[PDB]
Every structure is written in structure tokens, then in C-alpha cells.
Amino acid sequence: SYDRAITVFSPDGHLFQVEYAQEAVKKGSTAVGVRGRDIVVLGVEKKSVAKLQDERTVRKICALDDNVCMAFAGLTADARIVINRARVECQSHRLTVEDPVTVEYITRYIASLKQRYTQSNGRRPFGISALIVGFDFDGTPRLYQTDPSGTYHAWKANAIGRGAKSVREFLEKNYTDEAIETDDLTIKLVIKALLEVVQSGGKNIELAVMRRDQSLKILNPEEIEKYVAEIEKEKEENE
Amino acid sequence: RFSPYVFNGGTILAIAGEDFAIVASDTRLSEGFSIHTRDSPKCYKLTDKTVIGCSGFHGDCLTLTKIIEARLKMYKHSNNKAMTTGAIAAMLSTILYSRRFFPYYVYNIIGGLDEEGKGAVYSFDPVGSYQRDSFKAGGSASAMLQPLLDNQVGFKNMQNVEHVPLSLDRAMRLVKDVFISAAERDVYTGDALRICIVTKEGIREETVSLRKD
Amino acid sequence: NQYDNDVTVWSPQGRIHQIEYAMEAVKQGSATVGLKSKTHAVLVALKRAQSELAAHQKKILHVDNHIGISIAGLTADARLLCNFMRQECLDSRFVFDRPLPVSRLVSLIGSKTQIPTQRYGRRPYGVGLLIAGYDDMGPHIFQTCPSANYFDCRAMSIGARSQSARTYLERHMSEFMECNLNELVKHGLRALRETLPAEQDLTTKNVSIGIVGKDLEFTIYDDDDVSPFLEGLEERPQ
Amino acid sequence: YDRGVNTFSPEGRLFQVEYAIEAIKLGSTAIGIQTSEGVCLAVEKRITSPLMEPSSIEKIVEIDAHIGCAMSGLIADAKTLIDKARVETQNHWFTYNETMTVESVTQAVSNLALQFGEEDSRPFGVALLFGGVDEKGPQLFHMDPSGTFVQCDARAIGSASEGAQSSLQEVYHKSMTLKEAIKSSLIILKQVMEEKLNATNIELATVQPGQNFHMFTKEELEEVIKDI
Amino acid sequence: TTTLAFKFRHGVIVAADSRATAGAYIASQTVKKVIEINPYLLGTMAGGAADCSFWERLLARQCRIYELRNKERISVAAASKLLANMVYQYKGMGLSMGTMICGWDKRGPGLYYVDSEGNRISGATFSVGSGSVYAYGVMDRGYSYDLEVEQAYDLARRAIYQATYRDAYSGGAVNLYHVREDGWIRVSSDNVADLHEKYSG
Amino acid sequence: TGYDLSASTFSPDGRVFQVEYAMKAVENSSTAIGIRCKDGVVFGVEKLVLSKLYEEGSNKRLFNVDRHVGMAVAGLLADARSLADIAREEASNFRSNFGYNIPLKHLADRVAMYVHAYTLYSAVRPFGCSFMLGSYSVNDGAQLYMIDPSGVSYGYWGCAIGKARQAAKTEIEKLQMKEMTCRDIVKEVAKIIYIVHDEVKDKAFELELSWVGELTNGRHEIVPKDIREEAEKYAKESLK
Amino acid sequence: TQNPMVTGTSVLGVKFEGGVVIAADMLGSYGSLARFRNISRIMRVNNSTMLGASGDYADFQYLKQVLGQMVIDEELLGDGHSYSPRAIHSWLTRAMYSRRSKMNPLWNTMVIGGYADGESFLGYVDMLGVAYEAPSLATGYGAYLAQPLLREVLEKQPVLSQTEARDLVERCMRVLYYRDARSYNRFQIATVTEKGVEIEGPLSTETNWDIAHMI
């Protein structure tokens, strides 16, 4: 019955440790991810500088390939291991079949790794949940998410971590088909999501984009200040 | 030193007709300049619709025969149905490549019916390729038997000779004549003839003797 | 009651209860009856279904040209011992180029099932084997048990409510030895029709008959060569 | 008590397979019907979000050119067993030049549906429906986590399967046609689902002996739904 | 044995003979050499029957698995790469294999050339076998890019005729396959003596 | 007591109860005796039919390990079968590495060590068997040994294993065991087995007798008991 | 074994009406030196079959050991089933084939003679696993020398008596004593009928040398 161990079912038909492992993901930092028509964009919140150190090591958004990007929630160490494995897998695929790695393949890899990692003997399942964003086939934007169970599940927009119910609940009554991207609208959608964050402190927003042909662009918190100002301008025009 | 192989020789014929696959073979098993026996039939009845012949190195012939019988029983006892002819052909090709780097010194010819009820002769090689042909001769008497079949079965190199389908009794008397004519000039042929006929009604056999030297 | 946990533990009365629990796991299979003449061995089982539309779970499974088993209980261990059985049959068929004597095969089954009843990490096999075969000395009807204490009999019946079957086998084991195939098989289903509650009758699609003969290869039957076997019966004496 | 797989009950039984049969029930429903004309198959997706892309959730996947599938419950084992059975079919075709029949496919699957063992892992949490066209025409098979594999004429799995079986036994007979069976299936679907039936809820899977390739209907599904 | 393959505007032409000898003795006249991997890929048989047959059947297996995992066709360069990596693991153990991989890509035409020595290369025309040099000669006479369909057919047919005419190890039926964008289709299987009567005058 | 789950644990007074509980598992098992004459060893087992289902000739507890050695087991039957296979294997190794028949002392010591190794570790249980071992040799005479579930293996003239372990050897020891050849000892074993438990708790038993010695020239086999039919015509004269 | 040290020589075996007679000699030559001129080269297997070998004598001892073990095992099963001679032939062939397949061949040339259930049996096993049945077997140089005598009389008369067969074996062994350098004038006859297995003593031959008075 009881929450130990991973192997044994519940008396009413559940796996506890998979269900308990998602609470770690829900009890972590928040990060959203959207795809426009041609630009894909995501970003983590809660930069949370402590005034006595650098933050260039604590980066939660990285890349495995020149077509794909990372993002996660939950605890950080599992994310470190999963990313360091995923890079090696991406290069090993590149050593085979000479294509750029399709995002579907690397998500199947990560989910399969985590899955056979879950079924095994007394091993602690990874308390993370990734966002895997890439545009490969003719520049078609894709973004998939994981689960501690290991079920990849393709979305068009996403919200994980703390408050993610409300953070995703904003996305229905903002996300239109119209239009299109229109990269500025995609950016403003990211800005509306960051202003829609649980805190939206103003300076703790760190977002990074990809225009489906370039490499990752790390933004600058003066452009984001103009973004917050023009969001406030539109909010005042609503009155 | 130790040699792994010895040439035992032998002769295997096969003719795919319209609805019949006749496979015949002599029963002389020899070595060097000796005779070990005058009865060792190269034909083996696998199913009611598949007969295999195996010549060459005799021990590998025995081993291969028994392995094929084992996998036949495995497929049947797993999947409630007998194999086809081409299924057995593909399986034999997989096996012969599965011992690529220590080859069987064995020629192989499978006759039998297809799923249409027509003859199908699958030839082989010692390494494991195959093809669906109309007639093949395997063994030392291959060169003594292929061109005559080209003259009669293939009707090749002739003028104004129409094409009659190969009937049964015509094929039977052809097999008897090619084995007499090949046994006259070859040293690895004689003393019997084991003719196997695969119809839509089972497997018949027939024994025709030869000259005793 | 804490001694009743694992295979390793001896009880303070010496009766390892995992074996008894495996026996009771055998008792919840389908009913099956096996019996031999001097020349022909027949084992007849009963099929069951999950619903009406579904097909019926078969019990007699073929093994070899002269060996056939019945089964009761679990199906996973059934197919596992089937695989091992066929493996040993074809192995001796390959090496010695002979059919197996049955008794040494069943001793191999006992030695196979001995280790999972002795060490830790594997459960005993809930299994209901009724083996029919032909060595040089004729037909044999063996049974196993999950405690690996394989028996030889002349008429056995294991499963659910198999006891009335055993009483019938008791009162006709003298009659069994003389007859030919037809009334032998109908004695077998004259055990099965008392392995059922009396308000429903044995139809075609629920029964399975497997004959092995001294010159006859082992063959399974279902509904179509069983309609010749199901005629020639009277009603139960209501 | 009952705490793991290596222990029976006094009366029967385990009590881990039983919990697997329990764990099936949380999943979404599915209904497959064998007709001699061909095997039809239906499922429900239980779509949560509008951001949830519907064609990315798989229930009906492809095994062979004539062998479909449907899954249940736990998605995990429902991916694992598919990835095995695909390889199995390819090994069979490789060494045999022919199509592994559906019963033999499920034998290959249930040869390790229960090989569950952590030493010498846990039992799997999925019920599967297999449809295909062998030499005997159409075939519809139903397995379970326990490996106790049987053929079914028209099987209904997962959630709300009780009334599904009852109302299914109401309508079925042996001499059905195809389109009647299709609409008969989706009637039962929209009596057991909760949302409105539309173009995005369900997805069909119909394999015919002359139409072996493409066992699928895409947005003619809309036309089939609107005919009720 | 002589195979050739050249790609052009409207796809890829593949042709070969059908004679496979055994030493100084001809085994058969109708050995189908162009091994059909897919309805979108075509492989050949260039030196050694067993190695070509076996490894291309294994590659066909791998392509089918790749498709059923990604719901999408494999590219040509991918398959050539996988075949070279599989073949490399027995180097020096005595495998003879010189096959070619043809097929239509997301890029369009695709033509690679995989050896048991591992010479995986792209290119425009190729020719493998003992009498391959004869085909090189007459092909690189007749080669262009803007050729027509019947014109490339006559080029390949003439090429294999010259090849089987000067070499001893070549003859039999002239296979001729044509790769399109949608899928490959056999053109014709013509006998050498018919070609001799037809093109001799 | 408590203190008795694992086979590796001791008690606060110092004994292993798994060994004890396995020892008294054979207490409920069938009665099996053995006695040796001056030129052979005779075995005998009180064997019982279940009800009517048996075949009088199944599951014989009189095993036959080597050409001149065979067992007379009592306890759990399948464990005894496996133990017999181990003994056959050990004798085959000795025959293959030394070319001659196994001496019974060495065989008993190897088998006792094998039983002991099963008594040691915690993953495994002790055996639920107790068996007899008989031999004959022209250079050695007759040896009769005895192996408990623990593995303490030494020798006897007579022994009894089963319910009536004391109740047989109360009158096994009043035999004139030395001065008799084994053809007298046949009907002696017959009367001993026939005395214990004719009808009281159960219904029917049945008699098997194994037989080794000089008269078989070193062979070990079951008697032709039906030849000279020694039990019943003497058993009916032993009820009075 | 790459290099056979101690070879035997030719073994003769032939069926007759309800029995098979085998006779091989008792010579243990090494090189050309007849180092062991008194050894046994026929094992008497249990009651029906019977083995005779040539080649490396140590390998024959090894096979004697293994087969004696197997036969004692099946007899100690107590089930009433023994091995057919043909099962022995099959097992020996499989063993030799698997032994040569690992490139470590058993240098032997063996004859299995058995009589079981009305039918005589006479089998051959080579080093390479070449194996067959025959109405008459001759190993070594005997296949060159005495084999035409067997195939002459069996073509002259397909069945034989025990007396006729024994005489023919005697004459063939005399011939082998004449023109085989690895021969010796002391051989033993083994005979199986349904009365069991019987090995005769070390018989000798009677020679002629009257040609030596010619120049």
C-alpha cells in the first residue's frame, strides 16, 4: 500500500512515488514556454540574486543541440544529470544518421530513460519536468514537455512549477490564433506571461528566444523594461 | 594437419512443374577413392509439401537436417500452422549466413509447393543466398546436367520449337535419362536413384536402380 | 501467523504454508479429468470464458508428437513450463534422436520446480499438470502438484469441485481398462458432467478432449470432432 | 499484508495482478468490434487543455501494415510493449518473409507481460486490444496485465466498461456490417463519455482485408459523427 | 557482374545484368541483383551474394523500425551511414561488399555508394563490378543532366550492353529500375541477345 | 521462539529452531526402517496408498543412487528426489575421477556437508528429509549410515525413521542381528513393519523392501518380494 | 588431438541373421614400434550394443568412461528403458561433431554394433562426424583390403549365418595379417545375439608361406 516503495501498487490502483514525485516539480521555480509561428520563446522566473555571488552558473535554460533548448522545474541536480546525459545522446545520434536531432527523438530518449529508471530497483526517480523546444522540420516550431513518470506530451504553450495552474490559466484567455507570429506579438505574449507571473517583481524575469534558424538569444533587462512600460501603456489604454 | 572438410559428393536434381516439384538424388556416399555405402538418400521429407535435398560434406548435411527439423517443430508448435516453402527458404538462408565465418560445405535445394499449389525450386549456395528458379542441379554432376536441362526445360538455343508445359511423365523419363547419362561419365554417381514427387496429394517416392559400378 | 510469509520459513509445526496456499491456488482452476486404457490415454478438460462474446480459455495444449498436458491455475507459469517442456523434448529429440520416456521428463519437471520452493526470490508454480504420453511400456497419466510431488495414477481429476469426479473414477476404475476409445471418452465426460452444477449441461464450445494412442499421434479436439463424441449420451438421472 | 509479488493469499491468489486489474480502471475507455468485413476500433482521448495538441496523444498506434493497437491506463507500459512488439513483428518478417499473425503477436507480447521479477520488474499496468487481418480474415484480440490472453468478438476496456459490455451485448450479433458497427460503437461511446461528442474527442481505426494499409479515418470522422 | 547508377533531373536510373558465376562456371542467368529494400529505397548486389543480401535485408529492417518510431521516412544518407557503420564492425575479417543506395529524399535525388572497405561517398554516376570500367566509359560519353526519360533508358541499356559485351563475367537479363519522387518502378527486363539483334543493325 | 525466523540466527539459549522444526517435519512422515545382516543390508518402508487413486508402483521412496548404493528416504518427497540427484552426481564424479566404486563413508560425508551448507545460510531452508544409505563391498563388508535433517551422519546396525522411530527400535534391538543371513532378515523386516499400525489412524499401507549385499554380488535392487511372498503368509501368522 | 600418439588399426564388423559380430586386434603401436601388444579395443556395452574403435587409444578410453557413466545412469533410473544402439550412434555422432567444430578433434574411427528387438544394427562414426549404416563395416586399411570380401559375399548372398560370418571374419583378419604393417597375430572376436554380449578370447591366425620357396 504505503508510499514506500516504488514497486508496489496501491490497494486502489495507484503508484504513490510517481504521484508524490510530481509535488517536487510543483514545489519549484516557474517557467513558461510558447511557440510563435517562427520564433520560439521561453524563460524562467525567480532569478533570486542574493547580492553576494554571481548567477552565471545557476542557469536553468541551456541547449543540447543548435536546434533545441532546455527548461525544467523541480530540483536542480536531477536536471544537471539529465542534461549532461542528453547532450551525449544528441551527439551520439549526430554520429549516426546525419540529420539535426528531431525534438521528438530527444524527448522520446529522455522520457524512456526516466521511465526505465522509474521501473527499476529502488532507484530514486528524477524530480524534474522538462520543456524541450525546437524547430527542425522546415522550421516548424515544436515544444514538448516531460513528466516524472516519463510521458512526453506535446503542447502549444506550457507552464510548470509554482502556481502553474494560474500561470497556464492565463494562457487560454490570452492565446489567440491571431496573429500570428508576428514576432512582436510573440514577445508581447511572453511579456504578458511574465507580468502574469506569481510575483512579477520586474527584474527577476529571464527569457530567452530562438527564431528557428539562429542560436539562442539571451535578452537584456532594458528591452524588458520597455516591454513592461508598453504593457502598462496598453493597460492604461484599457481604461 | 586436421582438415575440417572432406568432399563426399553427390547429385541433386529439382524440377518445378505446373503443380509438382520433383526432386531426385542418387544414394552413393563415397570418400576419396572408396565407397562407404550404396544407400544414403539425400532427400528428406519435411512436411507434406516440402522436400529438401542436401549434398556436400555429409556431417554438416546431417546437422543441418536436424536443425531444420527442430525449427520446423518450433514454428508449428508456436503458431498452429505449417511453414510455406519460401518461409523455409528464408529460414535456411538466415542459418547459412549465421555460420558465415565457419561455413557449411553444403549445397542445398528445396522443392515444394507454393501457396498457389505450384512448384517452386529454391536453390542455395554454401553462404546463404537463394532464388526461385525452375530447375537446378547441385553437386559434382552440376555441369553434366545443367545444359541438357537448358536444351529441354528451357528450350533454349533452338529454332521454331514451340513451348509445351512440362508434364509429369515426361519429366519422370527425363530424370531417369539424365541420371543414366550423368552416371556414365561421373565417378560420384550411381547405384540407385531416389525420386521424390510432391503433388497436391502428398509425397510419392520411386526407386530406380543404376549401374552397379 | 507471522511465520506464514515466505518460502524459506519453516513453521513451528513444520508445515510450510506457502505450499498449502499454492495447492489452494491450484484448486481454483477449471475442472479436468485424465484417464487411460491399456492402449489409449484420454484427458478431458473444461473451458471457461470471461463473458459471452469472448472466446474460451483453452486448457489442453499440445506439447509433442506423443506428449500432451492439461493445466489448472495460472497461465503465465503454464506457458513457462510449456516452453521448458517443449525445449527438453526437442533437445532429447535432437541428441538421442528418440522420443522421450515420460517418467524422466516428469522427474525433470520436479527438479525444475524444486528450486523455486527452496530458495528465496521466486514463488512456487500454481500449476495443474496432467501429462499423457507413450514410452515403450504404454500410456501414462501423471500428475504434478505445486509441491513437485509428482504422482502416477490410472485416473486423476484436479481442479474445482473435482471430488465427485474422483468418486466416479473410483467406482469405474475397474471398468476403464478394457474398453476402446469411444466409451472411454464418454466415461471421461461422464466425469465432467458431474464436475458441473446440475442445472446446466455440457455443450460443445466448453469442453476439450485430447487423445494420445499407442499408434495414434497426440491430437486436440474442439466442437467439430467433438460433436461425434458428444452424441451417445443420456440425461443425468434427474 | 500482500506487500509484493512473491506471496500468495490463503484462499488464492495475488494481490499484485489484482492491483494491476484495479489500476487499469483509471484510464480512458476503448471499444473494438470484430466484423467479418473488418475490424473497427474506437477510443476516447480525455483531452484536458486547448493547448493539449490532440494528434499528439496516441491511443491507436501502428504495429504492422495490417496490425493496429489500442492502449489503456498507464501510458508507460503502453509505450514499452508497443516498442517491443514492433521489433517482434520485424524479427518475424525478417526470418520468415511473412506477416506474423495477430495471435502470434500477442503470444510474443504476453511471453513477457508476466516475466515480472526483480530478482532471478513490477507487473505491467496496461490492458491492450489487438486487431489485425491474418489468413483467417479479421482478428480481434484482448489481453490483460496478467497475460491471460483470449480472443474476444467485441471487447470494451477501462473505465465504464461494465455498462459498455452490457449495452454492447444488447446490440451485437455475428452477422454485423461495417458502418452499422461503427455507429453502434460510437453510440456506446457517447453514452459512456461525459463531454459532447465532436471532431476532437474520439478517433476510429478500421482495417479491412482489401484495405489493409491505412487503418484510419481522419475528419471523415466528422461526417460519421454528424450522421447520428 | 556490372551495375551502374546515375541520377539526373527526373530522378535516378539504376541498371544491372543478371549473371552470377561460380569461379569459371556460371551458376545462373537470372540472379535479380537490384535488391528492393523498400517502396522508396533500392539497393544493389555488387560483389558477393550473401553479404549484400543479408546486410541489405537487415538495413530494410532498421528502416522499417525507424519509420514506425518517427512516423516518417528515413533519408537516403541516413541509410547509407547505418549500412557503413554496420559493415565496418567486421573489417579485415573478409567481407566483400560494394553496394549502392538509391532513393528519393526530402532533398530530392539521393545516390550513395557503400563499400565493405567503407568508402561511403556521394556522387553523380557510379559503376561497380568487374566490367565496371566499360560502363564508366560509355556512360561518361552519354552523360548529361538534362536528359529525357527514354534517352536515359537507352543510355543505360546501351551501357550494360557494352559492359556485358566486353567482360566475361556479365550477361543475362538487363534489369533497369527507375527511381521517381513518388516511388520507384521497374522499367524493363531485357535479354542481351534481344539487344544484340535490336542494336546490331 | 521468536528468534526463529531466519535460519542464520541463534537463540538466547543457543539453538537454531529452523533446524529443529525441520527435524520434526519428518516426524509426521511415513515409517522407514533399515537393518543390516552379516553379509548385507535390508531396507523397508511402510508405504501408504492415499485412497484408491494410486497405481501400486508410483513415487517409490526406495531410490537407487549408485550401482551398489540406494536410499530409503522419509520426509518431503521432492526434496529427497533432489538430494538423490545430488548423490548420483557426487558418485559419478568419484567414478569419473578415480575409476572405482565410491566408499560409503566418503559419500556420506560429502552429502552431509551438502546438507550442512543448506542449513547454514539465510536465503535457504534446511531440508525436510531423513534418509538411509546402504552399501556392500567385498573389501569392506556392509555399512549402514544415517543422515538427519541437520547433517549429523554416522552409522548403525539398525535404524527407523518416521512416526514409530522409538516404537520400531524397541524390538529391532531384540533381533539376533549378526548370526543371520539377509534372507531371514527379509521376513524380519516384514514382521517389524507389519507390527506398527495395522488399522488404527489410517486404513491401508503397502510394503516395499530394498535389498543389497553379497547375495546380489554387489548389486542393489528391490527384492522380488512376490517371489517367496514372505510378508503376508507370515504377517497373518504374526497377529497371534 | 592434433597428433595421434598411439593408434590402433582396422576394425571389422558385419551383421548376420539375428546378430552382429565384430573383431579387432590387440595392438597398441606407437610410430612403428608395437609398444603395447596386449590391450583390449572392444568395450562390451550393457546388453545390446557394443563398441569398437581405432585411432588414439586414450580418446577411446575417454569415450569408454563417458558411455559407461551414461549407461549406468540410465540403468539406475530403474524405469526399464535402455538406450537403443541407434540412440548410441546418434549421441556419439553429435559428440564427435561438436568436438571437431571447436577444432579439437577426437582422432578416432568407431564402429557401433548392436542387436535390439529383432533388428540388428551396425553403425559407423568417423572423426569428422561422417556416420551411416551398413551391412558391413571396415575401418582403416580394412576398408581398402577386407571390404571387397564383405561386399563380394554379401552381393553373393545377402544374409548369413553366425558360422559363415565368423569364418569370413577369420579370413579377413588373416588377410590383414598378411599385408598390413600395423597388424598383429592376436585378435579377439566379439559377438552379440539376443542371448547377450559375448567376447571371445585372443584367437590367432594360421598363415601360409609356401610362396617363399619360389625365388
PDB file of N, CA and C in Angstrom, chain F residues 42-87:
ATOM      1  N   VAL F  42      19.309 -54.631   4.522  1.00  0.00           N
ATOM      2  CA  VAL F  42      17.929 -54.743   4.072  1.00  0.00           C
ATOM      3  C   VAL F  42      17.186 -53.482   4.474  1.00  0.00           C
ATOM      4  N   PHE F  43      16.520 -52.854   3.513  1.00  0.00           N
ATOM      5  CA  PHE F  43      15.669 -51.704   3.770  1.00  0.00           C
ATOM      6  C   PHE F  43      14.208 -52.116   3.770  1.00  0.00           C
ATOM      7  N   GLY F  44      13.380 -51.258   4.349  1.00  0.00           N
ATOM      8  CA  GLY F  44      11.954 -51.494   4.384  1.00  0.00           C
ATOM      9  C   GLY F  44      11.193 -50.239   4.746  1.00  0.00           C
ATOM     10  N   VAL F  45      10.142 -49.930   3.994  1.00  0.00           N
ATOM     11  CA  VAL F  45       9.384 -48.699   4.169  1.00  0.00           C
ATOM     12  C   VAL F  45       7.912 -49.048   4.301  1.00  0.00           C
ATOM     13  N   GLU F  46       7.271 -48.537   5.344  1.00  0.00           N
ATOM     14  CA  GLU F  46       5.817 -48.584   5.420  1.00  0.00           C
ATOM     15  C   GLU F  46       5.286 -47.531   4.460  1.00  0.00           C
ATOM     16  N   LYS F  47       4.789 -47.964   3.309  1.00  0.00           N
ATOM     17  CA  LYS F  47       4.310 -47.053   2.284  1.00  0.00           C
ATOM     18  C   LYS F  47       2.795 -47.138   2.191  1.00  0.00           C
ATOM     19  N   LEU F  48       2.131 -45.999   2.058  1.00  0.00           N
ATOM     20  CA  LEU F  48       0.677 -45.968   2.125  1.00  0.00           C
ATOM     21  C   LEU F  48       0.073 -45.445   0.831  1.00  0.00           C
ATOM     22  N   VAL F  49      -0.985 -46.100   0.392  1.00  0.00           N
ATOM     23  CA  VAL F  49      -1.831 -45.600  -0.682  1.00  0.00           C
ATOM     24  C   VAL F  49      -2.685 -44.478  -0.116  1.00  0.00           C
ATOM     25  N   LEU F  50      -2.943 -43.443  -0.920  1.00  0.00           N
ATOM     26  CA  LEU F  50      -3.835 -42.378  -0.485  1.00  0.00           C
ATOM     27  C   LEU F  50      -5.254 -42.886  -0.286  1.00  0.00           C
ATOM     28  N   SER F  51      -6.038 -43.045  -1.352  1.00  0.00           N
ATOM     29  CA  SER F  51      -7.277 -43.785  -1.154  1.00  0.00           C
ATOM     30  C   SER F  51      -7.452 -44.935  -2.134  1.00  0.00           C
ATOM     31  N   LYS F  52      -7.617 -44.603  -3.415  1.00  0.00           N
ATOM     32  CA  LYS F  52      -7.860 -45.638  -4.412  1.00  0.00           C
ATOM     33  C   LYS F  52      -7.262 -45.205  -5.744  1.00  0.00           C
ATOM     34  N   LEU F  53      -6.442 -44.171  -5.731  1.00  0.00           N
ATOM     35  CA  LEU F  53      -6.142 -43.404  -6.917  1.00  0.00           C
ATOM     36  C   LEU F  53      -4.767 -43.716  -7.440  1.00  0.00           C
ATOM     37  N   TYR F  54      -3.994 -44.442  -6.666  1.00  0.00           N
ATOM     38  CA  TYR F  54      -2.582 -44.665  -6.880  1.00  0.00           C
ATOM     39  C   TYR F  54      -2.438 -45.822  -7.863  1.00  0.00           C
ATOM     40  N   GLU F  55      -1.230 -46.336  -8.080  1.00  0.00           N
ATOM     41  CA  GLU F  55      -1.089 -47.407  -9.056  1.00  0.00           C
ATOM     42  C   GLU F  55      -0.228 -48.548  -8.522  1.00  0.00           C
ATOM     43  N   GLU F  56       0.102 -48.528  -7.231  1.00  0.00           N
ATOM     44  CA  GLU F  56       0.951 -49.501  -6.541  1.00  0.00           C
ATOM     45  C   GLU F  56       2.257 -49.698  -7.287  1.00  0.00           C
ATOM     46  N   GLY F  57       3.132 -48.704  -7.222  1.00  0.00           N
ATOM     47  CA  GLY F  57       4.273 -48.678  -8.107  1.00  0.00           C
ATOM     48  C   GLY F  57       4.597 -47.291  -8.609  1.00  0.00           C
ATOM     49  N   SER F  58       4.019 -46.270  -7.983  1.00  0.00           N
ATOM     50  CA  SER F  58       4.468 -44.904  -8.192  1.00  0.00           C
ATOM     51  C   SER F  58       5.366 -44.478  -7.038  1.00  0.00           C
ATOM     52  N   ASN F  59       5.950 -43.278  -7.180  1.00  0.00           N
ATOM     53  CA  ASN F  59       6.677 -42.438  -6.215  1.00  0.00           C
ATOM     54  C   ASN F  59       7.476 -43.193  -5.159  1.00  0.00           C
ATOM     55  N   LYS F  60       8.300 -44.133  -5.608  1.00  0.00           N
ATOM     56  CA  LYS F  60       8.926 -45.088  -4.705  1.00  0.00           C
ATOM     57  C   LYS F  60      10.003 -44.421  -3.873  1.00  0.00           C
ATOM     58  N   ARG F  61       9.834 -44.459  -2.553  1.00  0.00           N
ATOM     59  CA  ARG F  61      10.835 -43.873  -1.679  1.00  0.00           C
ATOM     60  C   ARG F  61      12.116 -44.686  -1.632  1.00  0.00           C
ATOM     61  N   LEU F  62      12.080 -45.940  -2.053  1.00  0.00           N
ATOM     62  CA  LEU F  62      13.312 -46.693  -2.214  1.00  0.00           C
ATOM     63  C   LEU F  62      13.958 -46.231  -3.507  1.00  0.00           C
ATOM     64  N   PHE F  63      14.889 -45.293  -3.389  1.00  0.00           N
ATOM     65  CA  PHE F  63      15.633 -44.822  -4.546  1.00  0.00           C
ATOM     66  C   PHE F  63      16.758 -45.776  -4.889  1.00  0.00           C
ATOM     67  N   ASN F  64      17.601 -45.381  -5.832  1.00  0.00           N
ATOM     68  CA  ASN F  64      18.746 -46.204  -6.177  1.00  0.00           C
ATOM     69  C   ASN F  64      19.866 -45.309  -6.680  1.00  0.00           C
ATOM     70  N   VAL F  65      20.792 -44.930  -5.801  1.00  0.00           N
ATOM     71  CA  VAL F  65      21.745 -43.881  -6.146  1.00  0.00           C
ATOM     72  C   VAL F  65      22.831 -44.419  -7.054  1.00  0.00           C
ATOM     73  N   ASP F  66      23.603 -45.361  -6.558  1.00  0.00           N
ATOM     74  CA  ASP F  66      24.688 -45.920  -7.330  1.00  0.00           C
ATOM     75  C   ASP F  66      24.350 -47.377  -7.602  1.00  0.00           C
ATOM     76  N   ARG F  67      25.255 -48.062  -8.302  1.00  0.00           N
ATOM     77  CA  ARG F  67      25.089 -49.468  -8.638  1.00  0.00           C
ATOM     78  C   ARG F  67      24.979 -50.345  -7.396  1.00  0.00           C
ATOM     79  N   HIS F  68      25.561 -49.909  -6.284  1.00  0.00           N
ATOM     80  CA  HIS F  68      25.551 -50.661  -5.043  1.00  0.00           C
ATOM     81  C   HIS F  68      25.025 -49.848  -3.869  1.00  0.00           C
ATOM     82  N   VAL F  69      24.548 -48.629  -4.102  1.00  0.00           N
ATOM     83  CA  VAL F  69      24.039 -47.761  -3.047  1.00  0.00           C
ATOM     84  C   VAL F  69      22.671 -47.244  -3.458  1.00  0.00           C
ATOM     85  N   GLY F  70      21.716 -47.298  -2.534  1.00  0.00           N
ATOM     86  CA  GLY F  70      20.426 -46.680  -2.763  1.00  0.00           C
ATOM     87  C   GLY F  70      19.858 -46.155  -1.467  1.00  0.00           C
ATOM     88  N   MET F  71      18.915 -45.236  -1.604  1.00  0.00           N
ATOM     89  CA  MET F  71      18.368 -44.517  -0.470  1.00  0.00           C
ATOM     90  C   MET F  71      17.062 -45.135  -0.014  1.00  0.00           C
ATOM     91  N   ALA F  72      16.713 -44.833   1.228  1.00  0.00           N
ATOM     92  CA  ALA F  72      15.414 -45.131   1.782  1.00  0.00           C
ATOM     93  C   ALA F  72      14.969 -43.860   2.499  1.00  0.00           C
ATOM     94  N   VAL F  73      14.294 -43.002   1.778  1.00  0.00           N
ATOM     95  CA  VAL F  73      14.029 -41.663   2.277  1.00  0.00           C
ATOM     96  C   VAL F  73      12.769 -41.652   3.124  1.00  0.00           C
ATOM     97  N   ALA F  74      12.657 -40.624   3.953  1.00  0.00           N
ATOM     98  CA  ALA F  74      11.423 -40.329   4.656  1.00  0.00           C
ATOM     99  C   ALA F  74      11.376 -38.833   4.906  1.00  0.00           C
ATOM    100  N   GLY F  75      10.212 -38.240   4.673  1.00  0.00           N
ATOM    101  CA  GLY F  75      10.075 -36.804   4.788  1.00  0.00           C
ATOM    102  C   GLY F  75       9.424 -36.216   3.560  1.00  0.00           C
ATOM    103  N   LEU F  76       9.850 -35.023   3.170  1.00  0.00           N
ATOM    104  CA  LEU F  76       9.321 -34.408   1.966  1.00  0.00           C
ATOM    105  C   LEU F  76       9.912 -35.085   0.744  1.00  0.00           C
ATOM    106  N   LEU F  77       9.047 -35.501  -0.170  1.00  0.00           N
ATOM    107  CA  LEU F  77       9.480 -36.435  -1.198  1.00  0.00           C
ATOM    108  C   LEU F  77      10.344 -35.758  -2.252  1.00  0.00           C
ATOM    109  N   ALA F  78       9.946 -34.568  -2.703  1.00  0.00           N
ATOM    110  CA  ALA F  78      10.638 -33.922  -3.814  1.00  0.00           C
ATOM    111  C   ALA F  78      12.027 -33.449  -3.408  1.00  0.00           C
ATOM    112  N   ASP F  79      12.156 -32.971  -2.171  1.00  0.00           N
ATOM    113  CA  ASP F  79      13.461 -32.651  -1.609  1.00  0.00           C
ATOM    114  C   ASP F  79      14.357 -33.885  -1.579  1.00  0.00           C
ATOM    115  N   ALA F  80      13.779 -35.046  -1.275  1.00  0.00           N
ATOM    116  CA  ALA F  80      14.543 -36.284  -1.307  1.00  0.00           C
ATOM    117  C   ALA F  80      14.943 -36.658  -2.724  1.00  0.00           C
ATOM    118  N   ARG F  81      14.083 -36.362  -3.701  1.00  0.00           N
ATOM    119  CA  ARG F  81      14.427 -36.601  -5.099  1.00  0.00           C
ATOM    120  C   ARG F  81      15.629 -35.767  -5.511  1.00  0.00           C
ATOM    121  N   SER F  82      15.616 -34.488  -5.131  1.00  0.00           N
ATOM    122  CA  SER F  82      16.727 -33.600  -5.455  1.00  0.00           C
ATOM    123  C   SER F  82      18.000 -34.029  -4.749  1.00  0.00           C
ATOM    124  N   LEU F  83      17.866 -34.489  -3.509  1.00  0.00           N
ATOM    125  CA  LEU F  83      19.028 -34.951  -2.769  1.00  0.00           C
ATOM    126  C   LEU F  83      19.605 -36.211  -3.397  1.00  0.00           C
ATOM    127  N   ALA F  84      18.729 -37.081  -3.902  1.00  0.00           N
ATOM    128  CA  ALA F  84      19.174 -38.262  -4.623  1.00  0.00           C
ATOM    129  C   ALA F  84      19.940 -37.886  -5.877  1.00  0.00           C
ATOM    130  N   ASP F  85      19.485 -36.848  -6.579  1.00  0.00           N
ATOM    131  CA  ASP F  85      20.203 -36.400  -7.769  1.00  0.00           C
ATOM    132  C   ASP F  85      21.582 -35.864  -7.419  1.00  0.00           C
ATOM    133  N   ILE F  86      21.686 -35.146  -6.298  1.00  0.00           N
ATOM    134  CA  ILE F  86      22.987 -34.665  -5.826  1.00  0.00           C
ATOM    135  C   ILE F  86      23.918 -35.829  -5.513  1.00  0.00           C
ATOM    136  N   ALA F  87      23.382 -36.876  -4.891  1.00  0.00           N
ATOM    137  CA  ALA F  87      24.208 -38.027  -4.547  1.00  0.00           C
ATOM    138  C   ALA F  87      24.662 -38.789  -5.786  1.00  0.00           C
TER     139      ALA F  87
END
